[PDB]
Ligand binder design. Structure first.
Ligand SMILES: [K+]
Ligand SMILES: [Mg+2]
Ligand SMILES: [Mg+2]
Ligand SMILES: [Mg+2]
Ligand SMILES: [Mg+2]
Lengths: 354, 125, 52, 165
RNA sequence: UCGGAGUACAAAAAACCCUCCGAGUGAUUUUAAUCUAGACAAACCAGUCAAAAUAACCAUAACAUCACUUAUUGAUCCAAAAU
RNA sequence: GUUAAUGUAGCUUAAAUUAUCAAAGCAAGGCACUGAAAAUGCCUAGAUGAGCCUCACAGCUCCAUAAACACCA
């Protein structure tokens, strides 16, 4: 009983007759490009993307962030081409390019990458690590303003904190310094939170730093709300994610309801909900920057639990599910002698009445 | 789980190519005009990408379809992967691309760039 | 054309013999097998003819 | 499965040709010579003959590549066996000859399929206009006699054929 | 006796002194280990796959390949050989 | 001069200071690679018709392409 397909068949567009007229592929790298483009379309039949967690497929992402800068494409198109012609005409560049002997100023590219496409590349990094899922749920923001976080480790050594980096707690024992370009006409809010690491509640996150009403670039001159606390990931469960959030606020806002005590060491007072926190001051603040790093356990974590938190250090361990075995039959058929060992409770022999 | 080398790798396939048993895959596409290098998760998403189509890299290179252009793409992507914390990835090149001059020297930039191929073996695979 | 079955003894001194089918017109065979006794690959040489 | 709407999604044998394998006993160049369509000429052979190997092949490649751009089917791009002639000049104040030089001839043939009657004027116009230097263009029909020169000679049959006659 | 196609049209099974092809081994070297979760198959005896783990060697290396690859085979007892 | 169709590269994407990271993809070429093609490696050339309008939607107009009334032996 043949049924009718629910939509167009894949290869029905091409004509079966007159095969020689149709141009062939002639290559294997063309087919891979064609196959991959075909594999991402929403077919009406069952596909791999449907069963293996495509994260609800198309999602209407809510955008809560600064508008993109206004740039004139007409002027930009001409100047970009004009700059390229000057570099193209250089004969010495052709001498190096042909002889396969040339390098590029990676630092110069780093500066320009941040200004041009840095915010968009950092957006998918946060989405990949699920920062938006655990902070604003479905809502997302574009890190428009660049943000730099660095830790003072040695006398002059400076450990940077990029998007998705890895920092040992020893480097993060002291408070970091934040540098960003902003004019003295607005205010900023800095927030450092431990997305995972809350003990009692799994859906809450700790707060390690909170500076309110920062005048321009100078972070120190801003009002301080929650003092810095070194990261304290558990020994068993490693790689906790710590995120720096930068908020741009129009008016001086009364951030007194979230004030924490000065030598704050009660973890029950560090309980935080960024979505709830941003809900109260949604009108005033607006996320503008982002920088997050991974952090695992080290020796410097131990003293935090003992000296600072006055806490016994908890140690976890990765426990796998027990192996699966079938129901034991009274007379196993064509089974090895080790069939009894699978269902043994302990290897110590147990005597009964004897 | 990915950083602890305990997450599940999508073992299987074998009758198709490339094998999808990885955490991160390096996807290098050589169009006739531009060179694009991608780092992809097994979910299909792209994490970090460095391509000559970017204006940041375009204004520093002479041409976007040279052997030198592949080196610049490799070096820029290697820096970004370190900034993104991705230190291990799997690259499955086409056999003729493995002997190509550009791809051979592109991996040399990755090795000296700090990013190491050959992702670590899963613990209790 | 008939093949011959020969027993090969390890040259590592340990007593380990595995049989291998060999063509009759071929000369004495010498392979590189892997005896579990030494847990290392060692030379094996043809010793005796058992079955044709 | 038959009853499922996704039946026949894996069909591919109708995309590629049958590609009959060259059987050991059935190996034969079975060419169905087409002759006299309404607007399609028969199979033609573009015989390019020149004294220099490099020049003859260079123009042979141009003809083959031009056909592909013009959607002209090319059945084969074989090469006729070369012929060598011993050039002997006469000696002045005498009659006995002397070996002057050894000149050879090289022939390259690009067999083409049928073409529209209108395109015959246009296609040949490009060819004869681009004859570089001394290349003897010869566009003749693909008869079996013109294709017999590629094979060898069989005196064993000629011994029988002579006695048969 | 053993395998492949049809009879047996779409999961499995399914007969005839039914219709047609084969097998009772060669060629080559990549000479192919030990140990164990879970299963297919099956009256029984037999047959098949196989993660993890250990050793071997790119120092985090296990499918011998090709010939329609599917069949290329024989239970105890007993006898001979180093065990 | 006048009457009716059209004008990102060869086709075509984004774009068209409507916003965005950006003028894209495939074709088309040179050289090397058993002799032809084809693959592969290396490598070359580049357009947003023109102005105005709108400056935060995009279209009108101009010019040109091109047909027509229509100069022609
Ligand atoms: K947690
Ligand atoms: Mg069963
Ligand atoms: Mg294994
Ligand atoms: Mg008995
Ligand atoms: Mg060629």
């Amino acid at each position: 009983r043949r049924a009718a397909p629910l939509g167009p068949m894949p290869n029905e567009d091409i004509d079966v007759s007159d095969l020689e007229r149709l141009k062939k592929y002639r290559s294997f790298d063309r087919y891979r490009r064609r196959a991959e483009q075909e594999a991402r379309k929403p077919h009406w039949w069952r596909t791999y993307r449907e069963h293996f967690g495509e994260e609800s497929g198309p999602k209407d992402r809510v955008d809560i962030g600064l508008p993109p800068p206004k740039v004139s494409r007409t002027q930009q198109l001409l100047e970009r081409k004009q700059a390229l012609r000057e570099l193209r005409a250089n004969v010495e560049e052709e001498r190096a390019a042909r002889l396969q002997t040339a390098r590029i100023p990676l630092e110069a590219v780093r500066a320009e990458w941040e200004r041009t496409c840095g915010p968009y590349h950092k957006q998918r990094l946060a989405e990949y690590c699920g920062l938006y899922r655990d902070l604003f749920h479905g809502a997302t923001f574009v890190p428009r303003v660049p943000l730099h976080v660095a830790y003072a480790v040695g006398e002059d050594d400076l450990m940077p904190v990029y998007h998705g980096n890895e920092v040992t707690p020893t480097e993060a024992a002291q408070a970091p310094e934040v540098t960003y370009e902003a004019d003295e006409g607005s205010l900023w809010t800095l927030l450092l939170t431990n997305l995972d690491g809350h003990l009692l509640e799994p859906d809450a996150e700790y707060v390690h730093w909170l500076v309110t009403n920062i005048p321009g670039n100078r972070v120190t001159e801003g009002q301080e709300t929650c003092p810095y606390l070194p990261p304290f990931p558990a020994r068993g469960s490693g790689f906790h994610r710590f995120a720096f959030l930068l908020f741009k606020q129009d008016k001086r806002i009364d951030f007194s309801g979230d004030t924490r005590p000065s030598p704050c060491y009660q973890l029950a007072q560090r309980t935080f909900h960024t979505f709830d926190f941003y809900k109260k001051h949604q009108d005033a603040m607006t996320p503008a920057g982002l920088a997050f790093f991974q952090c695992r356990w080290d020796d410097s974590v131990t003293r935090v639990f003992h000296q600072l938190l006055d806490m016994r250090e908890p140690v976890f361990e990765f426990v796998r599910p027990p192996p699966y075995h079938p129901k034991q039959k009274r007379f196993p058929h064509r089974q090895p002698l080790r069939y009894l060992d699978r269902y043994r409770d302990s290897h110590e022999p147990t005597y009964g009445i004897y | 789980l990915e950083l602890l080398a305990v997450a599940r790798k999508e073992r299987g396939w074998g009758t198709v190519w490339p094998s999808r048993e990885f955490w991160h895959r390096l996807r290098v596409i050589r169009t006739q005009h531009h060179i694009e290098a991608l780092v992809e998760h097994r979910n299909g998403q792209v994490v970090v990408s460095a391509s000559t189509r970017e204006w940041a890299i375009k204004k520093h290179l002479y041409s976007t379809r040279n052997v030198v252009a592949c080196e610049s793409v490799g070096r820029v992507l290697a820096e970004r992967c370190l900034e993104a914390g991705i230190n291990f990835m799997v690259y499955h090149p086409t056999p003729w691309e493995a002997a190509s001059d550009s791809i051979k020297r592109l991996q040399h930039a990755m090795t000296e760039g700090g990013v190491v191929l050959r992702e670590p073996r899963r613990i209790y695979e | 054309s008939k093949t011959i079955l020969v027993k090969m003894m390890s040259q590592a001194g340990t007593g380990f013999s595995f049989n291998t089918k060999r063509s009759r017109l071929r000369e004495k065979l010498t392979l590189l097998h892997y005896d579990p006794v030494v847990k290392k690959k060692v030379l094996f040489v043809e010793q005796k003819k058992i079955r044709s | 499965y038959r009853s499922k709407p996704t039946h026949g999604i894996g069909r591919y044998k109708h995309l590629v040709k049958a590609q009959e394998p060259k059987k050991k006993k059935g190996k034969v160049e079975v060419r169905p010579i087409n002759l006299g369509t309404d607007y399609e000429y028969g199979v033609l052979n573009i015989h390019l003959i020149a004294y220099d190997m490099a020049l003859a092949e260079s123009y042979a490649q141009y003809v083959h590549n031009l056909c592909n751009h013009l959607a002209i089917k090319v059945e084969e791009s074989y090469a006729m066996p070369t012929k060598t002639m011993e050039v002997l000049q006469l000696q002045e104040q005498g009659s006995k000859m002397f070996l002057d030089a050894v000149l050879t001839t090289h022939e390259r043939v690009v067999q083409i399929s049928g073409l529209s009657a209108t395109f015959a004027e246009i296609f040949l116009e490009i060819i004869h206009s681009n004859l570089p230097e001394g290349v003897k263009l010869s566009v003749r029909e693909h008869t079996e006699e013109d294709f017999k020169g590629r094979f060898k000679a069989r005196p064993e049959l000629e011994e029988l054929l002579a006695k048969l006659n």
